Design a protein around this ligand. Structure first.
Ligand SMILES: O=C(O)c1cc(O)cc(Cl)c1
Lengths: 58, 225, 281, 339
C-alpha cells in the first residue's frame, strides 16, 4: 500500500501548480466576454436572423 | 425540377443509400438482441460456449432465428453512462454462479460474491431502462454447488435461511431470493434456469423466453396486449 | 314484385339505423383519425385495422339513405341508378368489413402461433398491396348489383331491395351465405389456435394483459357470430321454405330486422378493435 | 504518517485555491450584464429534417464548410449528410454498432467515431477507390470512448470512460499523449479555437483544462453536482460552458478560474446531454432529456427560446462554423436543422 504516496505527491504537485496561476478579476473577464458578444453580435445569424435571401436553409 | 445533372445524380445516390439503409434496418429488426450480464467471470464463458477489449459480439442462429448477444465484461466504468444503449434489447441474459455463495469477492473486505450478484441483479432489474425488458436468469454451476453444499452450508451466505441443506430446497431458495429483487413484477417476467457445466438445452430456454417476449411485443402491435 | 305492409318494420328500422349510423360514424371516424395522424409509424397490422375501419365507416355513410327509405313506409323515390348504388355500396362494405375482419384474425394467428414466420416480416407496402387486391376482389364480387334493376314498383310504392321476398336472388343469396360460413370457419380456427397457444405459455399467461388479450380474441369472434348469424339463419329459413314463405310478412320483417345487426357489427367494431386497445393512442 | 500530512497539505492547497477564487471575485456577470438589452425571444424553425437513421442518434459533428454533417446512431451507420439538400453523401457501416461519438475532420478528409468498443476508428472519406474505408483503428483505451475531436488530419484527442483523455498520432496509431487526473469517466470534450488547449468534463462533477503540447492539467473547474455530459468553449477560447445531470449549465472562465453564471430553471429537472455556443457566444444552446433544446442567454441566464419538436431525448447538438444554423440530434432517429 506504499504506492499511494506517489499518487498523493502527484495530486499535491498538481494542486500546487494549479494554485500558482495568475488570475484576472471576474469583472474583467465578464467585460471581456461582454465585449466579444457585442463585437460579433451583428455577425451572429442565430442571434440576429438573416433575411431568407441570405439563408442557405430557406 | 430546378436541379442540375450532378444534383439529380447526387439525389439518386442518396436514394440508393436510403435503400441500403432500409435493407440493413430490416435485416437488423429480425435479429434478437441479448445483453449478457453477471458478476465477474462466474458463468458467462460456459454459457457463451453453449450458444457458440470492449464489447464482445456473439452471433448464433437457433431455429431460423439469429441472435445478437452482447457481453459487456471488462467494461469497468459507470454502468449508467452506457446502459441506456441496450434499452431496446429483447431480453437480458443474467449469469449467476451458484457455487460462489461462500466465496469472497476479494476486492472488498468481508464481501460475498453472491451478495454482489444480488446487488448487480437489483440494479439491472429495477433499472429505468429495463422496466419492460425480461430477464433470462441463468444459475450457473448447479453440480458443483450440489456437491459442495454438503461441506459448506448456505447459512454462511443467507443468515435467515432455515431450510435443509439439500440441493433442491436451497436452489429454490436462491432462485426465490433473486426473483424477490424484481420490484416490477406487473410489467416484466424473470425466467430462471439451472445450468450445469455441460448442459445442452440452454439455447432452447433462451429461445422460449425470447419467443414469449416477442409474443408480448407482437400483441402491442395488434393493439391486443 | 309484391306488396308487403310491415308497419312494424317502419317503427323498428328507422330508429335502429339512426342509432347505428350516429354511433358508428363517430367511432369509426375517431378510429380513422387516430390511425391517420396520431400513429406516426404504421405496421402491416395497422394497415389491416385501418382498412377494416374504412369499410365499417363507408357502410355507416350508406345508412342515412336506407333510413329515409324506411321512414317513407319503404318507398324509394331517389331514382333507379341511386338504388343500384346504395345497394352496391351496402353489400360491398359488408363484404369488405367481413374480409378485413378475417384478415385481422389471420394476422393475429400468424403473429401468435408462428412468431418467427416470414409472413410477419412483410412491409407496409406489401400490406397495402394485399388490402388493395382484397378491395379489388370485393368490388368485383359485388358489381352484379350495378348490372340489374332492383326497383319494384307497386301501388305507387317503389322498393329498392336486393334480398327480394319474391324468391332467391341467386348469387346474392350464395355470396350472402359464403361471406359468413367461410370467414366464420377461418376466424374460429384462428381464434381457437391463438387462445390455446397463449395458454401453453404459463409464464406469459399469468399476466393480466395476456388474459385481457385472450378475452378480447374471443370477444371479437362472439360479436361476429351474434351479429351475422341471425340474418344468415333468417335468409336460410326463407330460401328453404321459399314457396310458402314467398312475400310472407313475418319472414320479411324478421329478415329486414336481422339485416341491421350487420350494421350493428360495423358500429361495435371500433369498440372491440381500437378503443379496447391498451396501446393505440 | 506521510499520507495524512500530504492529505492535510492537499486540503490546505484546496483552501488556498478557494480563497484565491473568492478574493478575486468582486462583481459577477449578472451584476455587470443586467444593464444591457436582452436578446428577446429567439424563435427557430425546423428547416430540414434529416431522416435515415433507424436507432438512437448518439452524436453529431458539423463540417467546417458549414454544409456537411456526420451523425452516429446505434444502427452501426455513420451517415454523412448534405444539410442544404437533405442528401446522404456517405453511409459508413461500422464494425461496432455501439457508437457514442463521432467527429469530422476540419479539412473534411476524415471522420472518426468510437464507443463501447474502446476504439477510435478513423475513416478516409476521400479515397482513390471511391469508397469510405477505415484509415486506422486507434486502440489503447480501457474504457468506452465517449468523445473524439480532430486537431488536424494527423492529430486527434479522444475522451474515454477510463477516466483518461488521450492524444493520438494517426500516422503511427500510437498513444502520443495521455491526459490523466479525472476521477470519474470523462464524458465530453471540447477543443479551443487555436487547438492549443482543450477542456474535458467527466463524471467526478469536474472540468479540467489540459494543454496539448505539455500533456498535463492546467486548471480544474468544479461546481457541478452531478455527471458532466457536455462541454464547449466560448468562441474566443477564453471561457467555456458545461452541462450535467443536475439540470444546470455553468459558465467558466479560464483566466478568472471561476464559475461565472448558472443557466438553470425550476421547471427543468432533467439532465443535459449536449451544450453548444452560437457564433458570437451570446446564445448558449443546451440539449436536455425532456426532449427539447433550450436556448439560453449566455450573458444573462435567460431562456431565450425552446427548440421543441423531438419525440425523444436530444442527445447531440451542433452549431455551424459560420453560425448560420444549429442542428439537434435525438434518440428518435432524427436530425433537425434550425434557423
Ligand atoms: O344489403 C343490405 O344490407 C340490405 C338489403 C335489403 O334489400 C334490405 C336490407 Cl334490411 C338490407
Amino acid at each position: 500500500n506504499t504506492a499511494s504516496i506517489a499518487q498523493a505527491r502527484k495530486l499535491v504537485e498538481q494542486l500546487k501548480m494549479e494554485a500558482n496561476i495568475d488570475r484576472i478579476k471576474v469583472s474583467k473577464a465578464a467585460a471581456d466576454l461582454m465585449a466579444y458578444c457585442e463585437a460579433h453580435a451583428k455577425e451572429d445569424p442565430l442571434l440576429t436572423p438573416v433575411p431568407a435571401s441570405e439563408n442557405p436553409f430557406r | 425540377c430546378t436541379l442540375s445533372a450532378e444534383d439529380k445524380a447526387a439525389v439518386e445516390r442518396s436514394k440508393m443509400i436510403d435503400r441500403n439503409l432500409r435493407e440493413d434496418g430490416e435485416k437488423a429488426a429480425r435479429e434478437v438482441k441479448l445483453l449478457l450480464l453477471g458478476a465477474g467471470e462466474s458463468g458467462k464463458n460456459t454459457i457463451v460456449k453453449q450458444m457458440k477489449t470492449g464489447i464482445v459480439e456473439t452471433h448464433f442462429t437457433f431455429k431460423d432465428l439469429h441472435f445478437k448477444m452482447f457481453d459487456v465484461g471488462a467494461q469497468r466504468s459507470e454502468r449508467k453512462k452506457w446502459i441506456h444503449c441496450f434499452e431496446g434489447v429483447t431480453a437480458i441474459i443474467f449469469c449467476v454462479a451458484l457455487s460462489d455463495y461462500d466465496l469472497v469477492l476479494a476486492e472488498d473486505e468481508e464481501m460475498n460474491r453472491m451478495h454482489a450478484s444480488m446487488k448487480l441483479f437489483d440494479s439491472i432489474c429495477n433499472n429505468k431502462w429495463f422496466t419492460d425488458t425480461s430477464i433470462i436468469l441463468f444459475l450457473n454451476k448447479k453440480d458443483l454447488f450440489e456437491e459442495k453444499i454438503k461441506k459448506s452450508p448456505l447459512t454462511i451466505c443467507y443468515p435467515e435461511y432455515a431450510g435443509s441443506n439439500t440441493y433442491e430446497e436451497a436452489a429454490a431458495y436462491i432462485q426465490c431470493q433473486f426473483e424477490d429483487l424484481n420490484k416490477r413484477k406487473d410489467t416484466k417476467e424473470i425466467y430462471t434456469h439451472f445450468t450445469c457445466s455441460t448442459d445442452t438445452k440452454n439455447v432452447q430456454f433462451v429461445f422460449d423466453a425470447v419467443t414469449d417476449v416477442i409474443i408480448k411485443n407482437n400483441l402491442k402491435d395488434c393493439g391486443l396486449f | 314484385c309484391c306488396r308487403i305492409e310491415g308497419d312494424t318494420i317502419s317503427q323498428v328500422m328507422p330508429p335502429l339505423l339512426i342509432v347505428a349510423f350516429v354511433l358508428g360514424a363517430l367511432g369509426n371516424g375517431v378510429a380513422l383519425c387516430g390511425f391517420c395522424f396520431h400513429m406516426k409509424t404504421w405496421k402491416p397490422s395497422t394497415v389491416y385495422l385501418f382498412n377494416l375501419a374504412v369499410a365499417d365507416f363507408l357502410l355507416m355513410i350508406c345508412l342515412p339513405f336506407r333510413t329515409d327509405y324506411y321512414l317513407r313506409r319503404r318507398h324509394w323515390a331517389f331514382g333507379d341508378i341511386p338504388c343500384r348504388v346504395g345497394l352496391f355500396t351496402l353489400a360491398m362494405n359488408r363484404a369488405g368489413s367481413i374480409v378485413f375482419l378475417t384478415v385481422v384474425a389471420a394476422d393475429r394467428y400468424f403473429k401468435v402461433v408462428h412468431p418467427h414466420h416470414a409472413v410477419n416480416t412483410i412491409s407496409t407496402r406489401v400490406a397495402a398491396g394485399i388490402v388493395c387486391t382484397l378491395w379489388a376482389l370485393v368490388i368485383l364480387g359485388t358489381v352484379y348489383l350495378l348490372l340489374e334493376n332492383h326497383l319494384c314498383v307497386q301501388e305507387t310504392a317503389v322498393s329498392c331491395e336486393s334480398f327480394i321476398m319474391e324468391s332467391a336472388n341467386g348469387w346474392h343469396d350464395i355470396m350472402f351465405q359464403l361471406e359468413f360460413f367461410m370467414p366464420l370457419g377461418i376466424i374460429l380456427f384462428c381464434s381457437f389456435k391463438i387462445v390455446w397457444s397463449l395458454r401453453r405459455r404459463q409464464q406469459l399467461a399469468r399476466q393480466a394483459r395476456m388474459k385481457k388479450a385472450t378475452r378480447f380474441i374471443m370477444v371479437v369472434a362472439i360479436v361476429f357470430i351474434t351479429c351475422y348469424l341471425p340474418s344468415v339463419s333468417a335468409r336460410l329459413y326463407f330460401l328453404w321454405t321459399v314457396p310458402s314463405s314467398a312475400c310472407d310478412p313475418s319472414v320479411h320483417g324478421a329478415l329486414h330486422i336481422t339485416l341491421s345487426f350487420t350494421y350493428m357489427n360495423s358500429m361495435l367494431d371500433p369498440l372491440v378493435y381500437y378503443f379496447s386497445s391498451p396501446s393505440f393512442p | 504518517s506521510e499520507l495524512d500530512q500530504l492529505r492535510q497539505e492537499a486540503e490546505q492547497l484546496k483552501n488556498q485555491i478557494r480563497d484565491a477564487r473568492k478574493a478575486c471575485a468582486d462583481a459577477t456577470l449578472s451584476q455587470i450584464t443586467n444593464n444591457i438589452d436582452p436578446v428577446g425571444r429567439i424563435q427557430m424553425r425546423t428547416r430540414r429534417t434529416l431522416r435515415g437513421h433507424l436507432a438512437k442518434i448518439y452524436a453529431m459533428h458539423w463540417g467546417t464548410d458549414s454544409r456537411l454533417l456526420v451523425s452516429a446512431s446505434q444502427d452501426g451507420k455513420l451517415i454523412i449528410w448534405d444539410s442544404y439538400t437533405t442528401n446522404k453523401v456517405h453511409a459508413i457501416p461500422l464494425r461496432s454498432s455501439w457508437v457514442m461519438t463521432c467527429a469530422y475532420a476540419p479539412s473534411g478528409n476524415y471522420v472518426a467515431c468510437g464507443g463501447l468498443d474502446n476504439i477510435c476508428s478513423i475513416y478516409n472519406l476521400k479515397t482513390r477507390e471511391g469508397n469510405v474505408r477505415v484509415s486506422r483503428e486507434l486502440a489503447g483505451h480501457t474504457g468506452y470512448l465517449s468523445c473524439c475531436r480532430f486537431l488536424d488530419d494527423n492529430q486527434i484527442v479522444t475522451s474515454s470512460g477510463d477516466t483518461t483523455c488521450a492524444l493520438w498520432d494517426i500516422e503511427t496509431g500510437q498513444q502520443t499523449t495521455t491526459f490523466t487526473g479525472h476521477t470519474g469517466d470523462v464524458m465530453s470534450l471540447s477543443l479551443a479555437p487555436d487547438t492549443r488547449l482543450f477542456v474535458s468534463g467527466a463524471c467526478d462533477a469536474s472540468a479540467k483544462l489540459w494543454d496539448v503540447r505539455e500533456g498535463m492539467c492546467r486548471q480544474t473547474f468544479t461546481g457541478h453536482e452531478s455527471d458532466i455530459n457536455a462541454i464547449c468553449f466560448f468562441p474566443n477560447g477564453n471561457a467555456f460552458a458545461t452541462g450535467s445531470d443536475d439540470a444546470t449549465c455553468r459558465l467558466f472562465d479560464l483566466r478568472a478560474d471561476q464559475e461565472l453564471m448558472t443557466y438553470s430553471h425550476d421547471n427543468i429537472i432533467c439532465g443535459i446531454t449536449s451544450v453548444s455556443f452560437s457564433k458570437s457566444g451570446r446564445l448558449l444552446l443546451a440539449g436536455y432529456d425532456d426532449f427539447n433544446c433550450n436556448v439560453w442567454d449566455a450573458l444573462k441566464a435567460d431562456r431565450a427560446g425552446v427548440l421543441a419538436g423531438h419525440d425523444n431525448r436530444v442527445s447531440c447538438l451542433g452549431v455551424t462554423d459560420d453560425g448560420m444554423a444549429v442542428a439537434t440530434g435525438s434518440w428518435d432517429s432524427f436530425l433537425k436543422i434550425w434557423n
